[PDB]
Design a protein around this ligand. Sequence first.
Ligand SMILES: CCCCC[C@H](O)/C=C/[C@H]1[C@H](O)CC(=O)[C@@H]1CCCCCCC(=O)O
Lengths: 211, 216
Amino acid sequence: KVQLQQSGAELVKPGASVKLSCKASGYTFTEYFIHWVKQRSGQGLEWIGWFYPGSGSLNYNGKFKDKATFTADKSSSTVYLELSRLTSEDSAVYFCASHAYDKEPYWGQGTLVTVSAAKTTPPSVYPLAPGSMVTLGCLVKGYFPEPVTVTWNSGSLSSGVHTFPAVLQSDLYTLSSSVTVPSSTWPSETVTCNVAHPASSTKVDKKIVPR
Amino acid sequence: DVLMTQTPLSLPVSLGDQASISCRSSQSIVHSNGNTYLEWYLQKPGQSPKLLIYKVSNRFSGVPDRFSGSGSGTDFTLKINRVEAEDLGIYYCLQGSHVPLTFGAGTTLELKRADAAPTVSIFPPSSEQLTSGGASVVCFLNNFYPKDINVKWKIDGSERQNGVLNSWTDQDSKDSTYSMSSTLTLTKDEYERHNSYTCEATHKTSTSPIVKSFNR
Ligand SMILES: CCCCC[C@H](O)/C=C/[C@H]1[C@H](O)CC(=O)[C@@H]1CCCCCCC(=O)O
């Protein structure tokens, strides 16, 4: 079976370079084309170029000519995409795809590239209390890297919960989570947001109390 | 470069519906070898794109027969015969005949439901955050439909644009609505020199914005 195994997520310092890999199996390595595709968060797909490791032939999208470099290690059935001098615009998922001439392509699962100078940082968690239903929340601010896991009441409160995708600002992530409960249950009963951050091995609670 | 124009941008459907998506190229995408390299992909959030159709009309192995592709020259169509839940996501066409290879901008297949106005809630900075010398004001615009929405911030009746960050959820698995968060972040110093904070939600359900405010 044709399979492409891409390297793990990368955290890259601004200005630095990074080399992603794509290891192929299930076919004669030197006889398929490899393409690379970029996708920024919430945006579409963009073709970077093609590479034929069996001859070293290649072609770049002009948009990437000064940014991308394709190479291969035939001895390990691996192709590489090196990205130079990273900026925020280079933060994206990068996919590799392989195909024989005139045949259907097979896609890898993608490698996430995140550009930031931050070190591992646990989130600060702040309560969002209002000044028949009531909406509460918590603000999860200044953490790195992704992901965090947000729950409410240790997971027992799962209906009416919206946890929003994080946004990177000043090299750190911020997200919010809202929960909606009957007014008859808060503040008369306890509502607590729990935030786990695997990278820092932390988990903190924040009880929502009326101001 | 060859421009791939996908229509519609968004297609609301009910499960069981017929669906049809169009992809037009700016020039012929018949390759010099005689073949036409036109592919269709479906992508879900957090996943790689999955091949549905290649060379215009050929189904990739394992793809349900409810998917079919057709077309010639510059004019291509993907059809779904009775939409299932797992078909919801973003569809892309790709031409592979002329370098640089190019994708369409995508067509989102989403579940149709009744139009719904957002539930809007505003929150002042926590005392905890202020102690740290920061001040974020948060607005939740929850459970609305359709997904298009605009938010505007006002400080003391004046429009504020800098320091605003927004985030959007995917379509809800339970009620098929969308939600949005908007956060205005100031320094504590600047926050305490103003009094009134306002977020205004404009959605197709009404020509008048939904206005939530608080006063320090
Ligand atoms: C993300 C891209 C996936 C591949 C898309 C498509 O399936 C590939 C089409 C190939 C086709 O198999 C032969 C061909 O000419 C297309 C373009 C890529 C290969 C180019 C090598 C030789 C040349 O420059 O003509």
